[PDB]
């Protein structure tokens, strides 16, 4: 089963969570184990596009990732709420 993982710390350090493609809300990423505002790094299938959003409900800025990225970037980091994931 291919899917993104999520890090909690840089360059893929610390707890990690496995998501499948889809559209997760913040309580939805909270019962997955991904807390807000704890994205720091991640890893993406290739061909894989995901889409991660500073707000709730796929709103905020949105920042793209479409290859393994051991820092998302200092406005993005530690501000996921939201996110598409695209196969
Ligand atoms: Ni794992």
Same mark, same amino acid.
Do not use: C, R
């Given at each position: 089963?291919?899917? /993104?993982?999520?890090? +909690? @710390?840089?360059?893929?350090?610390?707890?990690?969570?496995?998501? =499948?493609?889809?559209?997760?809300?913040?309580? =939805?990423?909270?019962?997955?184990?991904?807390?807000? @505002?704890?994205?720091?790094?991640?890893?993406?299938?290739?061909?894989?596009?995901?889409?991660?959003? +500073?707000? @709730?409900?796929?709103?905020?800025?949105?920042?793209?990732?479409?290859?393994?990225?051991?820092?998302?970037?200092?406005?993005?980091?530690?501000?996921?709420?939201? /996110?598409?994931?695209?196969?």
């Amino acid at each position: 089963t291919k899917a /993104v993982t999520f890090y +909690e @710390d840089i360059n893929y350090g610390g707890a990690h969570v496995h998501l =499948q493609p889809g559209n997760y809300t913040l309580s =939805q990423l909270n019962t997955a184990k991904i807390p807000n @505002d704890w994205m720091t790094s991640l890893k993406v299938p290739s061909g894989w596009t995901v889409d991660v959003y +500073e707000n @709730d409900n796929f709103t905020g800025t949105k920042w793209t990732y479409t290859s393994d990225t051991p820092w998302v970037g200092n406005d993005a980091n530690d501000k996921m709420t939201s /996110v598409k994931i695209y196969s």
